[PDB]
Design a protein around this motif. Structure first.
Motif, PDB file in Angstrom:
ATOM      1  N   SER A   1      17.526 -36.228  34.756  1.00  0.00           N
ATOM      2  CA  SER A   1      17.961 -35.017  34.955  1.00  0.00           C
ATOM      3  C   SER A   1      17.117 -34.331  33.523  1.00  0.00           C
ATOM      4  O   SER A   1      17.212 -34.736  32.329  1.00  0.00           O
ATOM      5  CB  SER A   1      19.394 -34.615  34.636  1.00  0.00           C
ATOM      6  N   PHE A   2      16.437 -33.001  33.762  1.00  0.00           N
ATOM      7  CA  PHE A   2      15.715 -32.393  32.739  1.00  0.00           C
ATOM      8  C   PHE A   2      16.755 -31.528  31.927  1.00  0.00           C
ATOM      9  O   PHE A   2      17.475 -30.941  32.508  1.00  0.00           O
ATOM     10  CB  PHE A   2      14.676 -31.489  33.191  1.00  0.00           C
ATOM     11  N   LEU A   3      16.724 -31.694  30.571  1.00  0.00           N
ATOM     12  CA  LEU A   3      17.837 -30.870  29.542  1.00  0.00           C
ATOM     13  C   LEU A   3      17.089 -29.467  29.423  1.00  0.00           C
ATOM     14  O   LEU A   3      15.900 -29.303  28.673  1.00  0.00           O
ATOM     15  CB  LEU A   3      17.965 -31.705  28.637  1.00  0.00           C
ATOM     16  N   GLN A   4      17.583 -28.467  29.700  1.00  0.00           N
ATOM     17  CA  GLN A   4      17.036 -26.963  29.380  1.00  0.00           C
ATOM     18  C   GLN A   4      18.098 -26.260  28.916  1.00  0.00           C
ATOM     19  O   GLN A   4      19.283 -26.402  29.090  1.00  0.00           O
ATOM     20  CB  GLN A   4      16.840 -26.536  30.801  1.00  0.00           C
ATOM     21  N   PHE A   5      17.621 -25.654  27.815  1.00  0.00           N
ATOM     22  CA  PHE A   5      18.591 -24.763  26.952  1.00  0.00           C
ATOM     23  C   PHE A   5      18.398 -23.184  26.964  1.00  0.00           C
ATOM     24  O   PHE A   5      18.798 -22.637  26.423  1.00  0.00           O
ATOM     25  CB  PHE A   5      18.344 -25.353  25.369  1.00  0.00           C
ATOM     26  N   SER A   6      17.415 -22.972  28.094  1.00  0.00           N
ATOM     27  CA  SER A   6      17.104 -21.525  28.168  1.00  0.00           C
ATOM     28  C   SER A   6      17.007 -21.150  29.652  1.00  0.00           C
ATOM     29  O   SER A   6      16.425 -22.132  30.383  1.00  0.00           O
ATOM     30  CB  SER A   6      15.869 -20.949  27.372  1.00  0.00           C
ATOM     31  N   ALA A   7      17.042 -19.958  29.953  1.00  0.00           N
ATOM     32  CA  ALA A   7      16.663 -19.540  31.304  1.00  0.00           C
ATOM     33  C   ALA A   7      15.127 -19.933  31.830  1.00  0.00           C
ATOM     34  O   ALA A   7      14.404 -19.621  30.778  1.00  0.00           O
ATOM     35  CB  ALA A   7      16.894 -18.117  31.532  1.00  0.00           C
ATOM     36  N   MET A   8      15.224 -20.400  32.818  1.00  0.00           N
ATOM     37  CA  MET A   8      13.691 -21.134  33.357  1.00  0.00           C
ATOM     38  C   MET A   8      13.719 -20.782  34.680  1.00  0.00           C
ATOM     39  O   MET A   8      14.193 -21.855  35.510  1.00  0.00           O
ATOM     40  CB  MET A   8      13.718 -22.168  32.795  1.00  0.00           C
ATOM     41  N   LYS A   9      12.936 -19.842  35.349  1.00  0.00           N
ATOM     42  CA  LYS A   9      13.033 -20.067  36.958  1.00  0.00           C
ATOM     43  C   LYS A   9      12.072 -21.146  37.399  1.00  0.00           C
ATOM     44  O   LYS A   9      10.826 -21.138  37.321  1.00  0.00           O
ATOM     45  CB  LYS A   9      12.462 -18.585  37.199  1.00  0.00           C
ATOM     46  N   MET A  10      12.618 -21.895  38.078  1.00  0.00           N
ATOM     47  CA  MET A  10      12.102 -23.116  38.670  1.00  0.00           C
ATOM     48  C   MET A  10      12.372 -22.927  40.126  1.00  0.00           C
ATOM     49  O   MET A  10      13.399 -22.559  40.816  1.00  0.00           O
ATOM     50  CB  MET A  10      12.626 -24.281  38.035  1.00  0.00           C
ATOM     51  N   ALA A  11      11.231 -23.382  41.148  1.00  0.00           N
ATOM     52  CA  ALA A  11      11.270 -23.611  42.481  1.00  0.00           C
ATOM     53  C   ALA A  11      11.576 -24.953  42.802  1.00  0.00           C
ATOM     54  O   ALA A  11      12.215 -24.986  43.775  1.00  0.00           O
ATOM     55  CB  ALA A  11      10.081 -23.055  43.105  1.00  0.00           C
ATOM     56  N   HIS A  12      11.498 -25.976  41.984  1.00  0.00           N
ATOM     57  CA  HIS A  12      11.460 -27.302  42.249  1.00  0.00           C
ATOM     58  C   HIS A  12      11.989 -27.930  40.716  1.00  0.00           C
ATOM     59  O   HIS A  12      12.176 -27.244  39.854  1.00  0.00           O
ATOM     60  CB  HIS A  12      10.633 -28.019  42.864  1.00  0.00           C
ATOM     61  N   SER A  13      12.380 -29.393  40.828  1.00  0.00           N
ATOM     62  CA  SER A  13      12.517 -29.772  39.673  1.00  0.00           C
ATOM     63  C   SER A  13      11.289 -30.094  38.634  1.00  0.00           C
ATOM     64  O   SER A  13      10.237 -30.083  39.492  1.00  0.00           O
ATOM     65  CB  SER A  13      13.106 -31.220  39.835  1.00  0.00           C
ATOM     66  N   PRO A  14      11.542 -30.153  37.414  1.00  0.00           N
ATOM     67  CA  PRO A  14      10.103 -30.350  36.680  1.00  0.00           C
ATOM     68  C   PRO A  14       9.603 -31.867  37.020  1.00  0.00           C
ATOM     69  O   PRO A  14      10.409 -32.540  37.374  1.00  0.00           O
ATOM     70  CB  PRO A  14      10.771 -30.223  35.365  1.00  0.00           C
TER      71      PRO A  14
END
Ligand SMILES: [Zn+2]
Ligand SMILES: [Zn+2]
Ligand SMILES: [Zn+2]
Ligand SMILES: [Zn+2]
Ligand SMILES: [Zn+2]
Ligand SMILES: [Zn+2]
Ligand SMILES: [Zn+2]
Lengths: 284, 284, 284, 284, 284, 284, 284
Positions: free
Chosen positions: B232-245
């Motif tokens: 799981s990728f740890l993200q701390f801010s809004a980030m529009k993704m279409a798929h997983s990183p």
């Protein structure tokens, strides 16, 4: 049950016949029985099983040029129709294909009538091992060319001879010799275009009961078929021909402003399509 | 009635139909029967059983490309809900998870309502074999990556489409495209966090009956779901993704002083979640 | 009771439900029925029973990872107290064990009261399936690690939480963290020593009603328990263990002139004890 | 050696020993052989096989209380280590987990040393059937008590007793009784935090050879383990406890401004950890 | 030898004898064969199998008062010794139990010699179904008389008649009529105490080979036995008795200010012990 | 009332309790009822019967180590006495055996009195299932030895504890340690000899009412008993043995000129006798 | 042989004969078969089995006065001799009874021969159903006439018609009318006394082949027999009685100073004895 009687008498094993009669063993069953199966039915002596098995060998392989196995294995061939449940996703897929590919056509409902939807009465899976193996052999043959790609589509076919097709398969010897692209079997991407042919060329005489080409009572039948196209030759104008053009396995007539209103596909060999789904329906 | 009749008639065994009629043997039942089962129902002759079994073989294995077996196993599929009893420890564990994970939220109950506890009406185990097989195949595939660990959690899901999810599964083609982390399916470890999405995005219009977003009368539904997060990728801010990183199977949105108040889990492939429990409740 | 209805409806067998209603067949009953049992209740056709059994298979084993069999089958769990009559020799063995192991303690009965005999009111055999299975699995484990010897004893236990023990079993997570040997569950071979812990550590306040630690009026409860001691570590002075010493399964506090007046036995795993008998009594 | 001879002599079949000597059949092998296996090695007479099989039955089932099967089935147990290939996907995922979880710690590498990454020398899968069975039995228990969810994580473990753990498993009887959370087994999601403990508490005296806690010369060993957490108790400050809190299966210490710098996981019974990987490395 | 022939001739089936001679079918094998086993060896006709089975019934059950099944089925009885592996956990536990229980005795090694440890040469499991079932039947009796508690211990036994014990079991008719507590079978929890009796009372004349009681060359043998004690009568001074005290199943003599140096256990029924492990060793 | 109530409640079948109350179904009765008996009392639904039978299974077999079946089935056990009619041939044969075996003893009727005939008041058949099965198990054991012959006799026994015997059986733990042949149970061929012991050794103090050893008023009681002798050791002189001599199952003290005036039989295990008849009589 | 064919032809079921011929179903087999067995061999129709079963009922039960069942059951009856293994304790107990009972006689070993012990060659259990049933019916009668006690002994018998006895049983119609106690069958408790009658009254002329009464070469034979003595009449001098004394079932001749040296037992009905063992031996 006389073939079995002659076969067993020739071997000097007539005393076994009472077993063969009680177990309903015919010659076409016996040719498929090994030591294990013969021991099941009550041939307990190794010598008798040995004699039976080697007689079956001397018959099936020893006279291969007469093909006695083909004369024995006629039973069980033929078509069966498995009914689809409307609650299944396969039925809903086929129905969505029927309903979503309806198009308005250039005629005022002369051939297929006037309608926007179908009442789908039943959809049947057509199963016939002999026709299936014919089709897959040709599919492998076409894909051995054309870089390992069969280029297989699912298309609609309509004609008054659906019953003959589902039992004897598609046949280019009955081909639509007067079509826009010559003597082949024609398939459509749109169900409504195929609907125009289920009574004959240009709608034919209409339904047999009411003699109406727009009858809303009589049931229609379409085939939804696997079709191997292979390397397909694109066309826009009318072009009669008896066979495929060289190097190609089918013809694709594409839509044009002054030509086809809708896509058309033509195969010139009967074993390049299989009638997988039989659809019974009415226009509305 | 028709398909078994056809199958038996093609083998020449029509005289057996009255047995198949009294024992309610349909073709889907027959394709699963061997010598023992055929002997039970009164097919006594070995030859008749042999012919039936080899006909079934020619249908199933000989035409595997037509998939008649899938056409025959349509029945029996679908979802069943097994109602848990409040006196069971499973019901009590799920309710404890619901109650202990309530939190304060930034809005004054505008989206989820104003409450401290739930009235749990019932909890149901969701059972669907095809969906479970889909989930476990994806789970094996993810754990083959990520060093044999699926990283599987049980998380809450809220949505106005729980019926579609329990009958057809999680589907990224409906994904929350406007969500803080892009077009994914969102899960939370706080039940009250997921409660904010039950009636829609940010509470919707409230219940259909009252149009009230803090209705204490109408019943609500949450899912408790197994989710495989993998790496799981740890993200701390809004980030529009279409798929997983790249290299990852999911996204974990962590709490931050200027960011999320509570944890978020986003998957981008529907087959990575399975709804195990359906919880019906009111807020109080 | 709707899961049976959903299950039977999915199979297409809802016309059988009138039978299932009359026979009170719930899904947890149905998952245990075979051909013979289904034939008993009036499912006469073989195809129907076949479909029911295959559906039960596709549920119970096709989704074993969801453990649906445990959501069903929850009924029948729980403990039953079978009452022993004073005329039986089992009751008499237990009562004699109680009476003959009384001793005079250092305190003037402050913790347990002043007495030399008991008035036994009743003795009950505690029966709980899952607790017994847990106990026997742990006993098997201990005897494998020993020299095939479980070193099983029958020992007394006194606590103000016996009602929780007989429903949930012994639990080290509630262990007597201040005990002479640390965070363990304590047992004695003298009944008067376990009598000191009935109302609390060191007697508590006595009975709730009279608040008397020597109340001769209102009832008390002890347990007589099967204890798996395995390899037991002998101790002569207080040592606050959290777990049993390396290589051992329990602790034995032996009597000493300057230490314990009477022997004590300590386990640090709840599953190594089973509360066989529940004794209700008054001191005299 | 003599056990098979005695077993066969008691049956009066000592004339068969010449076979059992040439085929190296020992009693532990013989207790697993039936009619088919005994036919293969040349026991042709049915009566002889019958006698051998019934004698085996009288030994294994008739005296199950003596557990002769466990006495015979000792060989083959034990640990094997399977080396991962650095070119494998699994090796690379485990190495990514090792490298990406390094953190700077409060002390100037006093416990673990000063480094920013590792040089990985080996990664080995640990295979032991008895330990795996222990782990999976405990996992089923915990998941049955936690709404069918084991809450299983992959965590690092550091200790100077890695060898004993891989051969005997985790054992709470050796527990770190002085840790911030009592007598538990400690796991971390940061490889460097666990690296702090490989040479002992606080790093001990450093490596055996150089007595240096920041040695770059000699190899270190970490375990990568499957840990069943179940319902984990959320704790934010130090508190000594001997077992899990009631209703819970483990303790998770969360990072805090004045508390833990990094997450801690503590279990209190050793059967809910399994040491899947053994990682050998140096610090750089 | 001739029994099978007479049995088969009486039935008029002498023509089958050749099969019975090929397959080595004796009468004691035949009495255990049903329709399935007789089909295997080649008795194909139902009538012959029916005759054989009915004859066996008329023999085994019809003359049950003569116990022909016991005159048959003597083969396979008797003891076997299964050797333990020193690498096994069971071997190490038995050895630790033997080593850790060595005590200094009052005499200067007069009876057992001078030694602090043993050299354990081999440990064997003793297996004998007749003796085992005798012991377990008595164990059930005693537990039924002792509130479902056998009170089973593992104890040491020493005597010059070990070989007779391991084949014919313990026997009170050989009891030590002059012992301290009368005519019983004596056991100790200290291996060194048992070691004093292996060569006889007080050591007798010592080893046969060298006639030395403290010989360090000759092999000794001890039995490590299951002993059911039931309700045990405690004694602190000597008194002879022939049987147990009324209501008790064994006597346990315990040290006192004017009594034993070490514990002692006495059973007066031969079938209240089973010799599970035979230990061969030397003193050092 | 309550065991059955808890059992039925745990199954969720409380609504059936009223039936169980009218039919007086206790739990011990319920554990013995199947589908037939349950259908008889009015449990008409198959599902309820299935649940009850599975619960009974889960109690009786699933927890067999707790032996709940034995706790339940204590009722009905115990001894009953059936009077023989004076007109019966059984009464007359027992009385003839009493009267024809009166003999002239050496003492002038000091112990048994001065008499020639008895007045028989009543003879009673003693019936006890438990003691009978104990005796027959031992009889089978002894006849397995001693070439299939139990060597069963009917002999007289006289003692002041007959009431204890007929209820609890013979007990060698109460044996006659001071007898001419050690600590065993003594039987006489001559009723007059057993008559010497009805008030104790040497006649004791006689009848309690008149303290007369030759009282002709007070009723006496003798036991006429089955005794399994097995292989009997022939002895002519006193020998104080604690157990049977090795290889023998009884002692027969034969008459001698300088020894016994009349024959004696001695057994050393209490389960080798059964008190078949209790004879009440007076001396004359 | 042909009775099955007539029976089946009368029923109109001759078309089934080919099954009965192949399965070897004779009439004596058929009278024992029901619906289950008839369906096993291949009589599938219910009507055929019904007819066969009712025909068997009419034959066996309808004509019960002709006893056709006894005519059909002539097969299987006879005597078989089962050899005892020399290693079993049955063989050894019989041998020790043989050896321990040799005595010196009043004459100088004239009738039996000069010897001190025996060489035993074989021991054989005699198994004959009809003789055993006759014995047990008579034993039941005697016990019911003797206060439920059969007074059964094991005694020796010597005769030159041993084969006749083991095939026909004892017969008082061949009684030893010249014996000391009349026309009875004589048994002894000393083997050396029954040894005097193996070659006829008073030893006859010795072995057939040497005419030597002490021939150490020629095999002899004895019988070890169950003898129901019932109420045995006590006699001290010769008395030529033809039947048992009134009220008694046998006679015992007692040793006397001027009379018998060794005891004898005499019966007057052949059905009160059963020759359990046949002993082959030589004198030494
Ligand atoms: Zn029409
Ligand atoms: Zn509302
Ligand atoms: Zn009170
Ligand atoms: Zn170093
Ligand atoms: Zn020596
Ligand atoms: Zn009196
Ligand atoms: Zn001779």
């Amino acid at each position: 049950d006389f073939s079995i009687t002659q076969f067993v008498r020739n071997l000097g094993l007539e005393h076994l016949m009472d077993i063969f009669e009680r177990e309903q063993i015919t010659l076409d069953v016996l040719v498929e029985m090994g030591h294990k199966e013969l021991k099941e039915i009550g041939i307990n002596a190794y010598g008798h099983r040995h004699k039976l098995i080697k007689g079956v060998e001397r018959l099936i392989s020893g006279q291969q040029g007469l093909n006695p196995y083909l004369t024995l294995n006629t039973s069980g061939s033929g078509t069966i129709l498995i009914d689809l449940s409307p609650d299944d996703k396969e039925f809903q897929s086929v129905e969505e294909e029927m309903q979503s590919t309806v198009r308005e056509h250039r005629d005022g409902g002369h051939a297929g009538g006037i309608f926007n939807r179908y009442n789908i009465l039943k959809i049947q899976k057509v199963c016939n091992k002999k026709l299936w193996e014919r089709y897959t052999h040709r599919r492998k043959e076409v894909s051995e060319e054309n870089h390992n790609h069969a280029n297989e589509r699912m298309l609609f076919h309509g004609s008054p001879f659906v019953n003959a097709i589902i039992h004897k398969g598609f046949d280019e010897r009955h081909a639509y010799i007067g079509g826009m692209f010559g003597a082949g079997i024609y398939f459509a991407e749109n169900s409504s275009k195929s609907n125009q042919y289920v009574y004959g060329i240009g709608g034919g005489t209409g339904c047999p009961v009411h003699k109406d080409r727009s009858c809303y009572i009589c049931h229609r039948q379409l085939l939804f078929c696997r079709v191997t196209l292979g390397k397909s030759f694109l066309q826009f104008s009318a072009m009669k021909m008896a066979h495929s053009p060289p190097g190609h396995h089918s013809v694709t007539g594409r839509p044009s402003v002054n030509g086809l209103a809708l896509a058309e596909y033509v195969i010139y060999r009967g074993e390049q399509a299989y009638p997988e789904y039989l659809i019974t329906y009415q226009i509305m």
